[PDB]
Paper text:
The PI3K-related kinase (PIKK) SMG1 monitors the progression of metazoan nonsense-mediated mRNA decay (NMD) by phosphorylating the RNA helicase UPF1. SMG1 is a member of the phosphatidylinositol-3-kinase-related kinase (PIKK) family, which also includes the ATM, ATR, DNA-PKc, and mTOR kinases. Despite the confounding name reflecting a possible evolutionary origin with a lipid kinase, and in retrospect the ability of some PIKK family members to bind inositol-6-phosphate, all active PIKKs are Ser-Thr protein kinases. These large, multidomain enzymes share an overall similar architecture: a C-terminal catalytic module (comprising the so-called FAT, kinase, and FATC domains) and an N-terminal α-solenoid (that typically serves as a protein-protein interaction module). SMG8 and SMG9 form an unusual G-domain heterodimer.
In this manuscript, we reported a reconstruction of the SMG1-8-9 complex bound to an SMG1 inhibitor. We showed that this compound binds to the ATP-binding site within the kinase active site. While many of the SMG1 residues interacting with SMG1i are conserved within the PIKK family, two contact sites appear to be specific: SMG1 Pro2213 and Asp2339 contact the sulfonamide moiety of the inhibitor while Asn2356 forms hydrogen bonds with the phenyl urea/carbamide group. Superposition of the SMG1 active site in the SMG1i-bound structure with the active site of mTORΔN shows that the corresponding residues have diverged and would not be able to mediate analogous interactions with the SMG1i sulfonamide group (mTOR Thr2245 and Ser2342 at the positions of SMG1 Pro2213 and Asp2339) or with the urea group (mTOR Gly2359 at the position of SMG1 Asn2356). Taken together, these observations rationalize the specificity of SMG1i for SMG1 over mTORΔN that we observed in the in vitro assays. Superposition with other PIKKs suggests the presence of potentially similar discriminatory interactions: like mTOR, DNA-PK lacks a favorable interaction site for the SMG1i urea group (Gly3943 at the position of SMG1 Asn2356). In the case of ATR, the SMG1i sulfonamide site has diverged (Gly2385 at the position of SMG1 Pro2213) and residues in the N-lobe would result in a steric clash with the urea group of the inhibitor (Lys2329 and Asp2330 corresponding to SMG1 Leu2157 and Glu2158). Finally, mTOR, DNA-PK, and ATR active sites have a different relative orientation of the kinase N- and C-lobes as compared to SMG1, changing the overall chemical environment at the SMG1i-binding site. We conclude that subtle differences in the SMG1 structure underpin the specificity of the SMG1i inhibitor.
Author numbering: 766 to 773, 791 to 877, 881 to 895, 900 to 1060, 1067 to 1099, 1103 to 1151, 1178 to 1259, 1269 to 1305, ...
């Protein structure tokens, strides 16, 4: 709070990082220098994390608010001239000038936060937008010349930049030359500003000739008229320069600009530049790390030779070996001659994971790919192969654009040779080697970030060699310190540029280079005496940086190894670097193995331990255990599963006798169990052999036998019924892992899951001492009959006694108890393990805990008397924290036909009340308003009131007032119903009851219509009813007052629904006014004022049940919980937006209001209004009148009439009408709306990806659940983050198929919805996201089915408002993959394709309700 003002744990570290990022670009140099040091002191595991940054979000919102505002027109021509002069020439002609310009442009007569006025990024963005506004509002009559002069100016500059990009030897003036180190950074800044200006200009022109909807204000009539007649020229110019814009964007390291331009160019090609365009777009996507988009483009282009695109996608995923091999194969097949080089075995590498320009691109990609993994030998061999191929084919164009001198220098440096390294470095450009500091970068340097990175690396190498030679303290140290300081000052440029635009992430290469420079600067001055000289890249990044490549690890290792070797030249005490080196090498090896890089992984393992499959088994078979586990994993990834399993077993045997062996034993056992489960068919024999040997062999079997037989529960008697022999080994392994590490929750969860899955089947199928006991207690056929009756199907005691008496004609009780106890042993063990796992979580995923709680509840509900001593005692000590996700389920089970069960549930709820009463307050209070379901609620309310009785009394009064605020409406409804059914005793009774029920607002209503009783009495012995109804209807034709319809203040009651709130916000006030919406049943839109001064709107609904909506929301939350793991290594989060609903009785209810979401129908309405205005220049029809206007003549043409039923309607006529309607509406509504709402191309890419992922997740959820009536008004969109939200949920669970006009599409997928996903459509990120969502749902379908089953058996849920059983069966069939055919089970890909085809075909869209508006 103290920081980021006008005056000059991981949770706190994240905020600190965001603050430092925002302050990185500040007007004052002292602030930037101060925050840079703080940023450098934060570990990379937090700096490179994918957490959200609210600081950048504030700037984005401020900019969005400024653009959405109406134009100011205060920008003078001189300001624009100065801005353009600085952008195109570097001279600003003004000597904190941005702030002065902004202040001068503002007007007092006619709202960016003041604290944000000190950031240069905000000022630059504002200036660029203002300049674009001035250029557009002036009809292109800027001081740069005429309307065409500007076009030629920017066109020439862009063409020159593109030419330089193709040939780096052009050296364009004013762009590649600088007088010092500041000019070089200014060049990149100017280039970025130019790209932003072009994007803004295009957006403004589009808005001028077409228009937006609630995003940007419409320009004057003159501007619209001028841009409408000249849109063709603008479009032609943009299309002509789009080819060069992409190249310029690629040179500036801004893949978003080139990606957007490429998509637009591809879309415009509606009728030899296609290959280059596709290749360039693929390159940009690869730079953005988006393999899904590349795959989608490849599939899209396959319908128009381009099989190499998929290969590039592999490189975008982090796989370098496979990518290089594929590139070589493609080049060999395209050229006609052999071009492959020596590498790892293809059979193992694959198992682990014709134009002159295409060949050059593939060769360059292969070279860069080999350089990324730091394979100098491979690079040299590749160079020789390329030279030989070029000489044997006379290509004359196949050249590698990679500085070989730099590669040789790096090779010599990493090889320990410093003399040769210095000799090679002497030939590189830049300042000479240390023996002037303000100008270190050389001249003629291009603005490409790659060149800057190369220069920084060269400087670092020069400093390292200088220090090494100087070592063998103020002689050769001051110069090195100054050199390193300047190097660190130059490497901060990329971070500032990244912060200039809303990126939400920082460059990895630049950050690593900056940290390396800082480490070198600290080690030179301290001579390796402080812990600050080491790179902060620790192993903690394993669980927080899974979305990055292995490149940063190699960069860090490059200097870590150098420091390690340099340690031998220091005699004084030094810090321990061996541990850091081991940690870095191990983590890098893990990252490499997780992507198929077997060669690099083996190299790292060999380095830490100090091309054939048989070589690995002969070279590998505090960090000890981790190293062994990594070796086993590497061997497994190479295909040698047998050797890997044997090594793991051998390592676990030794770990079982170690000192600590806490986290290593559990990992070595769980991994082995998982691998054994994978190859169940090939390990069944070995497991059976082990089991047979246990009661009386391969190396793995003999090694596992000693592991399970390790001296210090599961007996062979309890598993001798329906349990297979190989499964016993897995159970024993889980038990061993649990007893060997009681502090690991996974060791208990695995055992509990195994025990439960086996016990369920054992009890289901079950529905020598025993014989001896029965014979002794009953001192031939009689014995057999008694034995069979005792265990026949074990009000049960009476039935068993009667059966035994009828068969034989008392010691059978003991035998029955023993057998029932033996059959349920699995459940007892599972319950104990689950209780221990829950107690250890007072470290695991939320879903992992929800499943356990649901299983325990299901067991206690189904089997209560069979296992009571376990659950009764466990529930009395289980913590209340992991039981906050199934509260409604606990309340719904308060009527179980059991005494102790209800008592235990009540006790658990009471315990949960303490320290968390804001979660079970509303349900209990509402429930209190037979005796089995009443005493529980009364006791819970009393227990909750024992702490704060005032809060309970106040909440009760509030609930009563809300219920009483749900008179005129009731009278009008009753009168209408009576009049409709008029055409007696029933009417008289109803009128009397209504009058009796009616006995501020009430006083006025009575004083105004108190003659109703007299009129009814007089008419009893009928115009009075009609007159009253007419008067009520006339007076009905919205705004109320809380005071007149009491109002409390300073309350201490929690808000209506705060499950996801660590600190509850007590209600402070209530809205003074209430609005009534016109959507069907009259709803009351109220507002609440919390303690935190925030405003929370709510929608109060009456006379309708809302218990199903709560269950649906809970199900959605449970589903969203399953995406916690996948969201830790993916930029676009997998989320399902949903609100909260809280019923207030049988027919009342309160629903949370979601702000910031705009319905999709608004865009169509605005477009219709714009079209109508345009047509009138030289209301709008409803979705029902317009449809009939076309269905009338069409039906009359064939001979039919409109009087015919909709069922007997030709399909061709409907298809023709639908096609005619689709050709009128344009598909650029949502696509252009989202584009205009964003601020920068980088933000546009993020918004588009988020929208695609959200749409895919929502579509899959709706299809699985069965959501219907998905019209435009029922779908909302969040433009700030581009997310899809759904509100209405009345039509669900396949209810739409039984309506008057059935629906066949599973989800809504129309022209605009599909067009907003990109040029590819549903073949890119959409299909992959849908497949991933289905995979996740299929993996965790057990918990979903259990939750649905619990929802079915709910006395407070009204389904008809065996239907529930049918719904559950349908959901189960859909989740299992047997929705279309129950005999064959389709795969995830097949199901996704079938659903997409069914939702995208025109046959189903033609026959649909006109209200769904399928033509948009
Ligand atoms: C352009 C006009 N609008 C769109 C229609 S809007 O309403 O004005 C509007 C709404 C929001 N945001 C928002 N947030 C939360 C909820 C709702 C909402 C709205 C209406 N109905 C429900 C509803 C009704 C019934 C049931 N349940 C059953 O039917 N049976 C059990 C469940 C839910 C929920 N809306 C944002 C902007 C705008 Cl414009
Ligand atoms: O070996 P680690 O580096 O510790 O990573 C493993 C494992 O990675 P591997 O697939 O390479 O074996 C899995 O990580 P992801 O695949 O999800 O990225 C994950 O679980 P899965 O194997 O089911 O995917 C989990 O292993 P576990 O199943 O035991 O939770 C994890 O860390 P741990 O092995 O330490 O738990």
């Amino acid at each position: 709070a103290n920081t980021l003002v006008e005056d000059v744990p991981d949770d706190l570290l994240q905020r600190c990082v965001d603050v430092c990022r925002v302050q990185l670009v500040h007007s004052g140099t002292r602030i930037r220098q101060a925050f840079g040091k703080l940023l450098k002191s934060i570990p990379l595991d937090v700096v490179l994390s994918n957490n959200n940054h609210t600081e950048i979000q504030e700037i984005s919102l401020a900019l969005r608010s400024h653009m959405s505002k109406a134009p100011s027109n205060t920008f003078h021509p001189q300001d624009f001239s100065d801005v353009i002069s600085f952008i195109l020439y570097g001279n600003s002609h003004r000597t904190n000038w941005l702030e002065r310009l902004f202040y001068s442009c503002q007007r007092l007569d006619k709202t960016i936060p003041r604290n944000l006025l000190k950031t240069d990024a905000v000022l630059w963005q504002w200036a660029i937008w203002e300049a674009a506004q001035f250029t557009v509002l002036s009809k292109l009559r800027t001081p740069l010349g005429r309307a065409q002069d500007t076009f030629q100016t920017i066109e020439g500059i862009i063409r020159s930049l593109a030419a330089h990009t193709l040939n780096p030897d052009q050296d364009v003036s004013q762009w590649t030359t600088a007088d010092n180190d500041e000019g070089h950074g200014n060049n990149q800044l100017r280039l970025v500003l130019l790209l932003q200006y072009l994007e803004n200009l295009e957006k403004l022109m589009y808005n001028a000739y077409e228009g937006c909807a609630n995003a940007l204000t419409s320009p004057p009539k003159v501007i619209r008229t001028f841009f409408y007649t000249n849109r063709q020229t603008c479009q032609d110019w943009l299309t002509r320069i789009r080819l060069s814009i992409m190249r310029v964007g690629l040179l500036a390291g801004q893949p978003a600009v080139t990606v957007r331009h490429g998509f637009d160019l591809l879309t415009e090609m509606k009728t030899n530049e296609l290959e280059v365009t596709i290749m360039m777009v693929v390159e940009a996507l690869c730079e953005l790390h988006c393999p899904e988009a590349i795959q989608g483009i490849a599939v899209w282009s396959s319908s128009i030779n381009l099989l190499w695109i998929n290969s590039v996608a592999q490189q975008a995923e982090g796989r370098f070996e496979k990518a290089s091999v594929e590139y070589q194969e493609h080049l060999c097949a395209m050229t006609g001659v052999d071009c492959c080089i020596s590498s790892f075995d293809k059979s193992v590498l694959t198992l682990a994971n014709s134009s002159p320009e295409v060949i050059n691109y593939l060769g360059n990609k292969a070279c860069e790919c080999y350089i990324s993994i730091a394979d100098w030998a491979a690079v040299q061999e590749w160079q020789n192969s390329i030279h030989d191929l070029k000489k044997s084919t006379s290509s004359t164009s196949l050249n590698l654009k990679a500085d070989f001198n730099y590669i040789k220098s790096l090779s010599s440096f990493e090889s320990g040779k410093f003399v040769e390294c210095t000799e090679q470095l002497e030939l590189l450009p830049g300042e000479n080697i240390n023996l002037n500091m303000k100008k270190l970068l050389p001249n003629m340097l291009s603005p490409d970030p790659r060149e800057l990175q190369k220069s920084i690396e060269v400087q670092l190498l020069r400093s390292s060699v200088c220090l090494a030679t100087a070592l063998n303290w103020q002689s050769i140290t001051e110069n090195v310190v100054k050199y390193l300081k300047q190097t660190s000052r130059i490497a901060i440029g990329p971070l500032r540029l990244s912060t200039l635009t809303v990126s939400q992430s920082l460059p990895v290469l630049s950050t690593l280079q900056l940290y390396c420079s800082s480490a070198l600067e600290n080690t030179v001055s301290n001579r390796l005496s402080t812990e600050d000289c080491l790179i902060p890249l620790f192993s903690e990044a394993l669980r927080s940086c899974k979305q990055h490549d292995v490149r940063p690890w190699m960069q860090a290792l490059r200097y870590t190894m150098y420091q390690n070797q340099l340690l031998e030249k220091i005699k004084e005490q030094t810090v321990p670097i061996r541990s850091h080196l081991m940690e870095l090498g191990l983590t890098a090896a893990k990252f490499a193995r997780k992507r198929g890089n077997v060669s690099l992984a083996t190299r790292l393992l060999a380095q830490c331990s100090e091309t054939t499959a048989q070589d690995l088994v002969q070279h590998f078979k505090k960090w000890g255990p981790e190293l062994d586990i990594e070796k086993t994993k590497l061997l497994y990834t190479a295909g040698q599963s047998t050797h890997a399993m044997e090594m793991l077993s051998s390592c676990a045997i030794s770990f079982c006798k170690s000192v600590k062996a806490e986290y290593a034993v559990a990992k070595s056992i769980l991994t082995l169990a998982k691998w054994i489960q994978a190859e169940w068919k090939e390990i069944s024999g070995q497991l059976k052999q082990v089991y047979r040997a246990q009661h009386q062999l391969s190396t793995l079997s003999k090694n596992i036998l000693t592991l399970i037989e390790l001296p210090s529960i599961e007996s062979e008697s309890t598993v001798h019924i329906g349990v297979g022999e190989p499964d016993f080994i897995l159970g024993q392994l889980y038990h061993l892992s649990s007893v060997q590490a009681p502090e690991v929750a996974k060791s208990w969860a695995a055992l509990a899951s195994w025990a439960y899955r086996w016990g369920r089947k054992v009890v289901d199928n079950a529905s020598x001492x025993x014989x001896x006991x029965x014979x002794x207690x009953x001192x031939x056929x009689x014995x057999x009959x008694x034995x069979x009756x005792x265990x026949x199907x074990x009000x049960x005691x009476x039935x068993x006694x009667x059966x035994x008496x009828x068969x034989x004609x008392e010691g059978v009780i003991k035998v029955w108890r023993k057998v029932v106890d033996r059959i349920f042993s699995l459940y007892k063990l599972s319950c104990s393990a689950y209780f221990t796992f829950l107690k250890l979580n007072a470290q695991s995923t939320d879903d992992m805990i929800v499943m356990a709680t649901l299983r325990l509840l299901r067991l206690l509900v189904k089997h209560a008397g069979e296992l009571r001593q376990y659950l009764e005692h466990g529930l009395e000590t289980t913590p209340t924290a992991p039981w906050r996700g199934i509260i409604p389920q606990l309340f719904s089970r308060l009527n179980h036909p059991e005494v102790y069960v209800r008592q235990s549930i009540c006790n658990l709820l009471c315990r949960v009340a303490q320290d968390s009463p804001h979660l079970i307050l509303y349900p209990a209070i509402v429930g209190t308003i037979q005796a089995m379901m009443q005493d529980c609620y009364s006791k819970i309310v009393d227990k909750l009131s024992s702490a704060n009785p005032t809060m309970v009394l106040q909440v009760q009064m509030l609930v009563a007032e809300l219920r009483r605020v749900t008179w005129d409406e009731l009278w009008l409804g009753v009168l209408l119903q009576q009049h409709m059914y008029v055409l007696x005793x029933x009417x008289x009774x109803x009128x009397x009851x209504x009058x009796x029920x009616x006995x501020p607002h009430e006083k006025w209503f009575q004083d105004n219509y108190g003659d109703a009783i007299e009129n009814a009495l007089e008419k009893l012995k009928x115009x009075x009813x009609x007159x009253x109804x007419x008067x009520x209807x006339x007076x009905x034709x919205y705004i109320l007052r809380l005071e007149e319809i009491a109002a409390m203040t300073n309350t201490e009651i929690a808000l209506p629904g705060e499950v996801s709130a660590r600190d509850t916000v007590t209600i402070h006030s209530v809205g003074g006014t209430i609005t009534i919406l016109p959507t069907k049943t009259k709803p009351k839109k109220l507002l609440f004022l919390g303690s935190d001064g925030k405003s929370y709107p709510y929608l109060f609904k009456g006379l309708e049940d809302l218990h199903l909506d709560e269950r649906i929301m809970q199900f959605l939350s449970i589903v969203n919980t399953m995406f916690a793991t996948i969201n830790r290594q993916e930029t676009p989060r997998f989320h399902a937006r949903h609100y909260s609903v809280t019923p207030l009785g049988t027919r009342s209810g309160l629903i949370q209001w979601v702000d910031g979401a705009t319905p999709l129908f608004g865009l169509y309405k605005r477009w219709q209004q714009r079209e109508a205005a345009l047509q009138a220049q030289k209301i709008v029809p409803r979705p029902s009148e317009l449809y009939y206007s076309k269905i009338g003549p069409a039906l009359k043409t064939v001979g039919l009439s409109l009087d015919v039923s909709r069922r007997d309607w030709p399909l061709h006529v409907m298809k023709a009408v639908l096609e005619e309607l689709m050709e009128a509406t344009p598909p650029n509504l949502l696509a252009k709306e989202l584009w205009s709402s964003c601020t920068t191309p980088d933000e546009w890419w993020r918004v588009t990806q988020s929208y695609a992922r959200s749409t895919a997740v929502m579509s899959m959820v709706g299809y699985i659940i069965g959501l219907g009536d998905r019209h435009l008004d029922n779908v909302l969109i969040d433009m700030t983050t581009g997310e899809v939200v759904h509100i209405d949920y009345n039509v669900c669970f396949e209810k739409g198929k039984s309506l008057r006009v059935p629906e066949k599409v599973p989800f809504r997928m129309t022209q605009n919805i599909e067009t907003a996903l990109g040029v590819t459509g549903v073949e890119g990120v959409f299909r992959l996201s849908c497949e991933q969502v289905l995979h996740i749902m299929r993996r965790g379908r057990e918990t979903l089915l259990t939750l649905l089953e619990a929802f079915v058996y709910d006395p407070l849920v009204d389904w008809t408002a065996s239907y529930a059983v049918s719904v559950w069966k349908r959901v189960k069939a859909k989740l299992e993959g047997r929705d279309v055919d129950p005999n064959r089970r389709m795969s995830v890909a097949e199901q996704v394709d079938y659903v997409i085809k069914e939702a995208t075909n025109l046959d189903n869209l033609a026959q649909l309700y006109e209200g769904w508006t399928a033509w948009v």
